[model samples]
Target chain A: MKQLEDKVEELLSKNYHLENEVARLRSAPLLVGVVSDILEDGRVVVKSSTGPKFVVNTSQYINEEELKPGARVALNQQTLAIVNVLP
Target chain B: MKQLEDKVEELLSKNYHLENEVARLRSAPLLVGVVSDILEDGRVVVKSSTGPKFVVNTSQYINEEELKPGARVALNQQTLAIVNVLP
Candidate 1:
């Protein structure tokens, strides 16, 4: 019974500490790639290093010059939304 | 001292499980903003919802006419790299 208590306590603390991380991973979409093209409509065609070229949309909520060729980007894997431009 | 050993072992496992997340947070940059301009040099001036307007360089690796104004983008909070274009 004491061992069971200890196990539960361990898991409880672990879960408590990692709760934010789990939530983050559930929604985290990071696809590393190089930008190959930016369409006229403002969508992008990225050539991922691990996978094929993926087309993604830039968030309209972002106001900046994030659209350009010859740069790196991290995109959301699920939504194909670009997350940021890398140097 | 056996309990001390158990504590150490537990901490070791916990650290192992959290290693990836910590590494990711250390390197990952996500800044939400709107694109106000796409300069001739391909750099951008962005307006972060969380802060004032700032200038940033678009990733040259990305190909797409991502530079047109009035689009959303995710940027690296620290390095000013554009992470992705958002819809």
Candidate 2:
């Protein structure tokens, strides 16, 4: 009975570890698309033909007029922009 | 010399652990605010006098008439809304 209980306990721990691992790996891939519009307050609203839309707060990154509407770009794997606009 | 090296290693490990713990605890506290406007494509833009404004993609959560512009609500601990409007 003790051995069986120990096996169950081991399985539970392994199960918990696997659950956490899966959660860590479950992040969505960042999709690349285009800048659809610029909101009134300077947020860039981007729309991807293949993924969900994103509203990027440009103030957090840089102060450049190049991020205006109708630009092609790629979002980083974390769904955040490490760079905007392709050279 | 070996004793001092061991102490430095221990301190480095402890420092690394503390850094990870600090990062885990540094998440911003969710703030309560109002929806200032709804974009034409259905995203709700919220503003807080005390915090950064958020552009919530409404389609990810729910569909309700109550999420319109000028609504007051509390965002969840993760800055995501579990509920909107006071009952």
Candidate 3:
């Protein structure tokens, strides 16, 4: 009986740790998608693949001249880079 | 030939300016993803679908109690919000 109790305790402890670890994994931030959009009223709205829309301040990463329409942009570390701009 | 050369120079100058403008467009900041996760000591690891994982300071956007396991989070403008907390 004592040996069985010890085994149960060991299993419980391991289970507890695994639960904690899984919890941590779920809480970790998930990158949804890359956003590409034109500036509208000093804000840019990006749509992710998961269908979440994000709005960010244009001034945070782009200048006025760079925020023109039909510009292809890339995002990295909250930084925006124009991949192409339509002439 | 001189007139043709002058026209080419004008085109070249205009092209140069356009290139400069395009360069600026490519250098803007972009919002990438929201991180939702528990703090491992102090850092929260977030995975962005763009296939990048980001390590952020847990303290910057979340608190210890809020960074519990099995937490659903939303990210906007680099701010993290806990949507649900698991027991």
Candidate 4:
């Protein structure tokens, strides 16, 4: 009986943690920015809608033809990473 | 004893699902690209290392100063979004 209780308890605890983990991952909101320039050194100059310019990197999966000057993009809120292009 | 067994089984199933969910969220890999141009309409033209150029968007959290001509950036593998600037 005790062994079964222990099993159930551990499973419950793990499930709880995993639920929190999934929520945490899903709750993050992406930020927005505009592309200002593409440098020759292989970096990008972005004019964030929030009033600052930054030298940043682009994602490899991005469509090279679509990314251009003056394009609005989404950013990861915490790491400041660009996520995708916007319409 | 039977009740305990049932409870443990249910908990195990739940834990299993959660484990899969967490792994799915964590397993995605980012792609790489280079910024080619920032357009007048606010989009970015990126030269994906894969040999195609696309007009993409920049993330809001990106440092606009760092996103310049020729910046190397990372992208979302599935969505082709720009994530951040790289060194």
Candidate 5:
């Protein structure tokens, strides 16, 4: 019984990274798409050709004006969370 | 100026995962090896053919007795932080 418990714990410990990745995916949703339009309150409206639209916080360090329209980018596909301002 | 600052902040935010991976790599070095001894205090000593030995905490649920000598394991090559016990 003790050995089984220990083994289960060991599996759990090893599962940390995989768990983190799943959690991150739930929050960060990685899907490639386009973003256009910047809201006044530091948010971006993202549109995917696949018909997914997301309005995510622009977040710190992304120039709204600096970002031109129709630029290809990667981010939280579902949330449109900022990833990068592609050149 | 504010835009640039925002952009920088955005970049930092995006870099979080990459930074985390680098930090995790630094903390959890990956190497294959075997564990021989389990200390009374829940630490395991791992030895690699590549000449690396790590002593790490077995952590909340591993049957030390079940782990016979020469049991292969995958864990942090540096800190020996518990990942898993192979069979």
Candidate 6:
């Protein structure tokens, strides 16, 4: 019984670490960009930090009225879509 | 004895998932950047995907000779340091 309990404790410890590791891995990196234009068609133009200009869409949750040329925004790393406006 | 064995099996199954989750979490997002200049000090200027220009350092393992203007490279999400030269 004692041996079985020790084994259970070991497994519990290992699982704890694994759970924390998964939580760490869930975080993804975001990129910063500047909004350069907002078209009447609702799509916005942004210039990414890497020096290219892209016409990208904003997240549906974002208030387009707050977006303006020269505003800093956070972009999704994969889609280049504006996810949030930053200060 | 049988009950303990079944408990062990359950723990093992849970740990298996935790291990795989940790492996997946270890993967991080990398940003693509364009090299615009290589300075005499050995530091390079890169334009990141987020639309900003920064003077960042390269990973020591990289071959600087292969890096030049217009080269595409990967940058670490947190440090913005150059990690690899891309095609």
**Top DockQ: which candidate number?**
6
Please name the candidate that would achieve the greatest lDDT relative to the true structure.
Answer: 6
Tens digits of per-residue lDDT, candidate 6, B1-87, equal 678777888998999988775444333578898997776766666788877765565665567778999999887666566777889
Put down candidate 5 lDDT per residue, B10-71, tens digits, no spaces: 55444564445333322322334577787776677767534667676664566666565688
Candidate 1's DockQ is 0.04
Model 6: how far residue A67 lies from native, Å: 1.0
lDDT of 5 by residue, A8-85 (tens): 455545455544753463344456657665456444555654553444444344565666568765664534455566
Per-residue error for B7 in candidate 3, Å, reads 18
Report the C-alpha lDDT of model 3 over A1-87, residue by residue, as the tens digit: 455555455555655555454333223243333444544344454544444444433323244576543443332223232232223
- The candidate that wins on TM-score is 6
Instruction: lDDT winner between 1 and 5, please give it.
Output: 1
Share of true Cα-Cα contacts across chains kept by each model: 0.01, 0.00, 0.15, 0.36, 0.00, 0.38
TM per candidate comes to 0.39, 0.33, 0.28, 0.41, 0.31, 0.52
lDDT of 2 by residue, A20-71 (tens): 9644333222234577888788667876534568876532444356676677
Residue A74 local lDDT, model 2: 41
Residue B17: error of model 6 in Å? 6.7
Find the 10 residues in a row with the least total lDDT in model 6 chain B.
Answer: B20-29
Q: Which residue segments of model 6 deviate by more than 4 Å?
A: A1-17, B9-87
Worst 10 residues of 2 chain A by lDDT: A23-32
Interface RMSD (C-alpha) of each candidate? Answer: 10.6, 10.1, 28.1, 8.6, 22.8, 7.3
Candidates in descending lDDT order: 6, 4, 1, 2, 5, 3
Q: Candidate 5 at residue B54, lDDT?
A: 67
Report the C-alpha lDDT of model 6 over A1-87, residue by residue, as the tens digit: 878878888998888777764543354445667899999899899988767889898999998888999997767777988887765
CA displacement after TM-score superposition, residue A24 of candidate 2 (Å): 12
* Candidate 4 residue-wise lDDT, B48-76, digit = tens: 76568888877778887787788988776
**Listed models, DockQ each:** 0.04, 0.02, 0.07, 0.17, 0.01, 0.20
Q: Flag regions of model 5 displaced more than 4 Å.
A: A1-29, A63-65, B1-87
